[PDB]
């Protein structure tokens, strides 16, 4: 009731965020679930975790719809963004339930925080040309490092980058890439693919019909592109779409935001050290809840340290000093927990990855603060 009802809502998102802390990165851990029916689900993806679990906390139910929005854009690595919404709720404990800070005052501070965050996003902006196929090849392979299809992606990711550019082009560049039709053929080898430019069913070169147990082959000459995938196993087709069909978000994000940000949770390192410097120039009542947001920003990279088995207190001492002094291009190695910068790490992510992450986090955090209490038993 009142402030006591908001405490249960903070711990509701805190308990869920603590489970997905280990779900980020190539070192991401797994979680096992036990339902009252006796079924067990063991996976490292937080998407199916929030869908199968029915939570008794009404505040945690709002995070289920937020995960559907984050998964609609990318879906890989964006599940852990909910932690940022949970760290802000825990950050208000010295303020909301102690200093009696009004929620709108915190929301107004988040409005200035979201505005200043986009300025920091434009500071780490690193544009790159999309005409180079080799530059775009290593870009889509970023999310592949979490799977064993890495060495298989040589004949896989090349088909996705060529099909999107046909249905993208320009107009701005806004277009519809959903006209592509991907066909999956079970059995065979993953190395076997089909290169087809046209519509699958003037001066046509040739017409032929192959032999396939599923259906036949038909070519339609236009004045649109299709993909025929041959999987290396029976049920592997589910993971193939995650590394190709779901990987189309990388090709969509590079067209909307050609700029590149540090990948593997290395972006918010330069954001947290910069947000603390922008707070000293505010000099107001809202400075304390505004500066405390940087304390919630440094909790996200600690997930890598928890995955790398390091000490987040001692390691971030030198790590935060590199982003606030040397340069903002430095980063954190997630594998071994090392200071190796993102320059030689070879992975960069678009700016929109963190843009949609912070935008949906602030919008979801303020709505949870606007709720005074929760009542039950209405019998609708």
């Amino acid at each position: 009731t009142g402030r006591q009802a908001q405490i249960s809502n903070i711990t509701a998102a805190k308990a869920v965020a603590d489970v997905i802390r280990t779900c980020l990165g190539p070192k991401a851990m797994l979680k096992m679930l036990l339902d009252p029916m006796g079924g067990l689900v063991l996976t490292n993806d937080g998407h199916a975790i929030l869908r199968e679990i029915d939570v008794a906390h009404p505040a945690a139910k709002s995070m289920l719809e937020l995960s559907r929005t984050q998964d609609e854009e990318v879906g890989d690595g964006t599940t852990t963004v909910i932690i940022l919404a949970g760290e802000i709720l825990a950050q208000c404990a010295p303020y909301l339930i102690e200093k009696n800070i009004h929620p709108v005052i915190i929301i107004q501070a988040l409005k200035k925080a979201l505005t200043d965050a986009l300025e920091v996003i434009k500071q780490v902006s690193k544009p790159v040309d999309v005409e180079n196929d080799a530059a775009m090849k290593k870009l889509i392979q970023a999310s592949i490092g979490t799977k064993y299809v890495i060495h298989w992606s040589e004949k896989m990711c090349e088909l996705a980058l060529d099909a999107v550019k046909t249905v993208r082009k320009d107009l701005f560049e806004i277009d519809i890439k959903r006209y592509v039709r991907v066909e999956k053929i079970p059995g065979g080898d993953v190395l076997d693919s089909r290169v087809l430019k046209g519509v699958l069913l003037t001066n046509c070169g040739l017409f032929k019909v192959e032999m396939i147990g599923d259906e036949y082959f038909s070519f339609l000459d236009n004045c649109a592109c299709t993909i025929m995938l041959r999987g290396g196993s029976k049920d592997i087709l589910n993971e193939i779409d995650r590394n190709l069909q779901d990987a189309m978000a990388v090709a969509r994000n590079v067209m909307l935001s050609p700029s590149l940000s540090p990948g593997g949770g290395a972006t918010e390192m330069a954001v947290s050290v910069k947000l603390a410097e922008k707070a000293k120039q505010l000099e107001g009542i809202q400075q304390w809840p505004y500066q405390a947001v940087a304390d919630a920003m440094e909790c996200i990279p600690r997930t890598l340290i928890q995955n790398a088995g390091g000490d987040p207190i001692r390691l971030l001492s030198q790590l935060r000093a590199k982003h606030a002094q040397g340069n903002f291009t430095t980063g954190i190695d997630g594998d071994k927990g090392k200071i190796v910068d993102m320059v030689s790490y070879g992975i960069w992510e678009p700016e929109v990855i963190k843009q949609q992450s912070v935008k949906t986090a602030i919008e979801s955090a303020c709505l949870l603060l606007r709720v005074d209490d929760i009542v039950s038993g209405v019998r609708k």
């Binding site: 070192k27 096992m32 679930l33 679990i53 088995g309």
Partner: protein, 509 residues
Amino acid sequence: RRDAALKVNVTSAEGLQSVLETNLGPKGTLKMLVDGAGNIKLTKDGKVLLTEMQIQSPTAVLIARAAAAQDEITGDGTTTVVCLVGELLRQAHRFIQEGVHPRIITDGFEIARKESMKFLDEFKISKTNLSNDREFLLQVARSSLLTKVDADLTEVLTPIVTDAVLSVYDAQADNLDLHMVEIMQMQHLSPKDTTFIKGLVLDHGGRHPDMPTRVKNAYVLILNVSLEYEKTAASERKFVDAKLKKIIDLKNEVCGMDPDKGFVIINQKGIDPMSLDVFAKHNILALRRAKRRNMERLQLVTGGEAQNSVEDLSPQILGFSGLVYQETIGEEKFTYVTENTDPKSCTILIKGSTHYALAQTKDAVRDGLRAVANVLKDKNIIPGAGAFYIALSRYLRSANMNKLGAKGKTKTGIEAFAEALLVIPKTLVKNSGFDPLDVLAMVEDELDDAQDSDETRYVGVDLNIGDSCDPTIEGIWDSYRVLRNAITGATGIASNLLLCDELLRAGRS
């Protein structure tokens, strides 16, 4: 605060290996399963045991589901994979509970995983399968039956499996498990009286007791339309005699001099016993109520062909068999036909007291025939008798500055994997009441003496006398592809428990 659930989940999971601890090796004892209806089954197969056994801890229930893939991988002695990962988890509690992170130590076993196949690549031994030498074939049968049945049933089923694996073979290494399927299950005599049949056997027979019990040359012909009439009365029986005239004419046309040959009738419907009296003079065998699956296998073995009308008869569609004899057991008459036109498919006649003792032999020869089939398919065989437990553990134990590949805590994971491979050989002698510490002095220390002699020797462990032996002399051998996915798959299955931070109870309400 942290997890702390990992040590609790494995603690309840450690009870699975304690139950299965006595299931390893030929000296182990069989586990019994009983239902509420009175049916009792005694077998060591992990697929049947883990399915019927319901563990209160759900953690061990999901891990037992991963053993279903071990059927094609191994199929015989899958408990080794379960007991190997049991101590593998305990070695992590001496580390992770001390502040070692699970992800750090997991990468240590992932490196030793792939590196174990590189050491196994030079460890395997290749043989020539084209010569079909019975010396190596009888040893592969001993590597299975001894771990399944006793020594009395060993010398029985060994030539049965040996003759079965040689029945299906080719210079092109063409083998089909679906080619040999039917296995006769009968209750009579004792399980030690089972024999190997050289041809297919049918579960149905004729109603005429005076039919010849032994036939030299029998011509098998599948008849579709029933010989006896069904419905539209004196003209109905005249049509049967008209059909019997073609059978008598066909019998005398083929061989008209010496009655050393016979003819077999396969009917889908019943046959009037009054019409069978004519077959007694011509020595013609008849059948009734034959299943479709049984008739389809006769065309590929006996060489016959299904015929609709008996008005058209030719010797081209008639198969032949070299030996045919019948035996009447109880009220069910069976027909034993061997030496057919295409005798590449055989059957195993199994007799015993009840289905309780019959389940032991059925599951033994089913996977035993497939295990020896992998020897002809994959010429690379791995020395058994616990020879690779110490060998693979010794290569990763000595590293220093030559070959290491890891650092820090990841280096300790390789040493923990070497100690995790030694739980199986210590368990083999523990079930027999032997001290594994004294066994290593005569086995593990023996390999160091042979290493200084500039010779490659693989020494096994004899459970009978509790001393060292030779896997080549003893004859214990395992296929390469069997232990390749077993060792690699054990790391992936054990990782599922290593990758689990905590067990949370929640779901659909």
